[PDB]
Amino acid sequence: DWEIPDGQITVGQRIGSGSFGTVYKGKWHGDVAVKMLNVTAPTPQQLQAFKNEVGVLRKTRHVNILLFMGYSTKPQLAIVTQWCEGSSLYHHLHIIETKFEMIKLIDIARQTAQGMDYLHAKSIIHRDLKSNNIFLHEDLTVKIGDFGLATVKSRWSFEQLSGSILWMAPEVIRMQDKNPYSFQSDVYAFGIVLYELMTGQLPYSNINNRDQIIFMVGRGYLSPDLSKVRSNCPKAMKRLMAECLKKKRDERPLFPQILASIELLARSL
């Protein structure tokens, strides 16, 4: 099974922490990432939140999904994943401002679409897809993860997630539908990731008020500016972006179509 016996993991450098967990770099048959719960004696809800996450990760076996490696219960409840040298797509695009070639931007898009197509086939709705959750292993291979460390009521069980408003579909901002999170809300988030790749920027860079952005997207008054895409961005890519970013969720394509469209436009370059 996937349970790792006590004393096998060497916990190293602390990377970060939030209200729910703390991530460390470690050693277990090579470099690993270790995410521990902040409490040693968890409540029935905290333990259920932990088991829910292990439950989703253990269903994944795909090169574009962060490789789950096992979990521990002793001395603490922890999740073990592969350790990746590299940086998140967010870090590359918006912090160090890496200038990838169009061919590589399309390659990153194709790889993300593969991982998302895989998750949706396993009935997993991510609910927090964004460039921060796309890791570039050796600055080349996409590893989709969920790197948030904050307490979330029913994360892998539902309720609205915050701090990722730029990637939030209009119906996710509103919270008026019977089921606001869907494969289509993940597709909208993916449409924002495509915008980040093709422009090198975060949407709505010219609006300095976050509350106004939330209000406007939800009302359907604001959409990303597609004329900001790089001069050599293929027309088929700009077309795909507009379909993913549709205000009405029913008008959005699903990942089998998205992946087929990227595979086809990557051939024509």
Ligand SMILES: Cc1ncc(NC(=O)c2cccc(C(F)(F)F)c2)cc1-c1cnc(OC2CCOCC2)c(N2CCOCC2)c1
């Ligand atoms: C340890 C761990 N255990 C469980 C999860 N869970 C998930 O991903 C997860 C949970 C549920 C569903 C899914 C879905 F995507 F499949 F839908 C994924 C994440 C991490 C972890 C947190 N934070 C990290 O790094 C920080 C953030 C990046 O930048 C560096 C600091 C890493 N890395 C790994 C690469 O190598 C550098 C360190 C892994």
